[PDB]
Amino acid sequence: KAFTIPVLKISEMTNSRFPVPVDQMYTSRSEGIVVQPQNGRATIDGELLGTTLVSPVSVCNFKGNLQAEVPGQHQLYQLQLTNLDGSPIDPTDDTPGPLGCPDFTGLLYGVASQRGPGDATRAHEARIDTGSDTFAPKIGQVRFYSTSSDFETNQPTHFTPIGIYIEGNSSDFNQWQLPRYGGHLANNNHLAPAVSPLFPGEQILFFRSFIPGASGHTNGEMDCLLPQEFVQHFYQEAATARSEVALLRFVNPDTGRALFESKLHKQGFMTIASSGDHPIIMPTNGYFRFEAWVNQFYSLAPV
Amino acid sequence: AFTIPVLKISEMTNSRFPVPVDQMYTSRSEGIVVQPQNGRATIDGELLGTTLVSPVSVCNFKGNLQAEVPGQHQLYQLQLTNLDGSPIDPTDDTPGPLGCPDFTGLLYGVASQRGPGDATRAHEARIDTGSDTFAPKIGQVRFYSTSSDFETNQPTHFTPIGIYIEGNSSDFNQWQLPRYGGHLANNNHLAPAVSPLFPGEQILFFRSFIPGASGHTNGEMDCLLPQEFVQHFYQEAATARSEVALLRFVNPDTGRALFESKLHKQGFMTIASSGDHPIIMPTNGYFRFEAWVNQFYSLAPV
Ligand SMILES: [Cl-]
Ligand SMILES: [Cl-]
């Protein structure tokens, strides 16, 4: 079975780290930054890594029982998580945390909804601090705060992510700081490895989204390594990787010729020949196409 | 030539609302016109109605916060763009802009803005898709919010979350199409209604229970094709060798095949069944293409 890429414009791609469309391609030097996201992690021969799931609407969602209001802390609610598909959290799993769990620290803004008893429903805005000491999704312990007290204990509860809340303090959004999946008394394990460009003059090519902000000042930048459609496609195809690097061409369909070329590394990230922090803006109908198997030494024309 | 993506039910996305599929479901749909406009694609990849390929975009809106509606209390006038940023073209051969809700109800979600600069703000919001002001085809939609914290003339996005049941707004009717053009306009360029034609068969739906924000509702939202089937058919552009693709639902744990279904060329599935009930199957089961048949192929009941 031959390796293939799905044919997609940038505007048809889905961010694999937050359930919103990709806005632009982006490259960065990543000065002082360790790139180690756990969502959107898949090898090109079909192995999912980190907390990556294939569903494109599920990343950064939570589901669970509303166990209780945290004693003494009004309108702070303790969830007992399940997995997003309904199966119980199993902390013996070989994952950093539950599939789809946020891979960044910050004030995640969204809506907590309930259905029950019966068909009675209710929903209100909520905030989950993925940087807080007790944020421990690996063992199913997550809390959310809400300005509403209209939540019932022991009813099924879902958290739909919307964006990030900026208070202007230590809790501020850091898309490259992994949470402590087990809370403040446990260390992360089974992480997908960090990635970096190893070849001179190359930088990682990211797929960037500007996610919504709920207060304060932020551009909401969320950079993933692969659009969710590439994850889904490699998962489906599980094609044999004939070399360590798949050479991609970003094709202008109006001319048939290359706009630029990129190296898709087998472990699931792309590099380009570029320098600095800036978007990669192209004609809107451009798409990546698989060109050939090459090695890590292949020299790319700069873009 | 023709393939179906290998997906469990829990890995499928509802094509009419951006949530995972909860179950397969079948119904007689007596006295109901089944004519959803999202999740509509032929098996050779032609998108119909308002169907787009992005799985996170259906029921989203974006555009300029034109004004607080004069007279009204905390009503905001959106001037839509298309979800890809391009301008709304009312002469397009669609009933409305791609991704537009295809049901009438009080759609609940969060309206967010960014601007001026990187200043941001977001608050709960709801859009009555049955209101006579709801006219997305010409880019006019209003939302209500308990908050007054919205800047005029800043980019605004509506992220859908669920449905809101209250007496003084339209109840959630998933099979009642909005008037995409506002009060007086007739809908046009609609994907057609679907129904089983062979005796003993019913449509097979992929059902989600979308969140409720208030009131009593089971949030039932039935689509004809999971969004991943839509994306796959769009990618493949494979020629339909007959009018029906015969599919088989199989459990990979045991190799047991559980039932067969008829995937009609124009983009929906039927099974031999009777009554309104979920189709509960082993968790790891999935559909697989078996053969090109016609509309008269007779299935064993499930
Ligand atoms: Cl597979
Ligand atoms: Cl195409």
Numbering used by the authors:
A (entry chain B): 225 to 527
B (entry chain A): 226 to 527
Reproduce, without paraphrasing, sentences from the article in which this PDB structure was first reported.
Noroviruses are highly contagious, infecting both humans and animals. The human norovirus capsid protruding (P) domain binds histo-blood group antigen (HBGA) co-factors for infection, and a recently discovered bat norovirus (GX) was also found to interact with HBGAs. In this study, we determined the P domain structures of four human noroviruses and one bat norovirus using X-ray crystallography to examine structural features linked to potential interspecies transmission. The principal structural difference was a variable length P2 subdomain loop (Loop A), which was located near the HBGA pocket.
The P domains of GII.9 (AY038599), GII.23 (KT290889), GII.27 (MG495077), GVIII (AJ844470), and GX (MF373609) were expressed in E.coli. The five P domains were structurally equivalent with a root mean square deviation for C-alpha atoms ranging between 0.586 Å (GII.23-GII.27) and 1.645 Å (GII.9-GX). The cross-reactivity of the P domains was determined using direct ELISA with a broad-spectrum human norovirus Nanobody (Fc-NB26) that binds to a highly conserved region on the P domain. Fc-NB26 bound to GII.9, GII.23, and GII. P domains in a dose-dependent manner at concentrations less than 80 ng/mL. Structural modeling of the Fc-NB26-binding site indicated that GII.9, GII.23, and GII. P domains contained most of the equivalent residues that could interact with Fc-NB26. Our cumulative data show that Fc-NB26/NB26 binds most GII genotypes, and the epitope is vulnerable and a therapeutic target region for GII noroviruses.
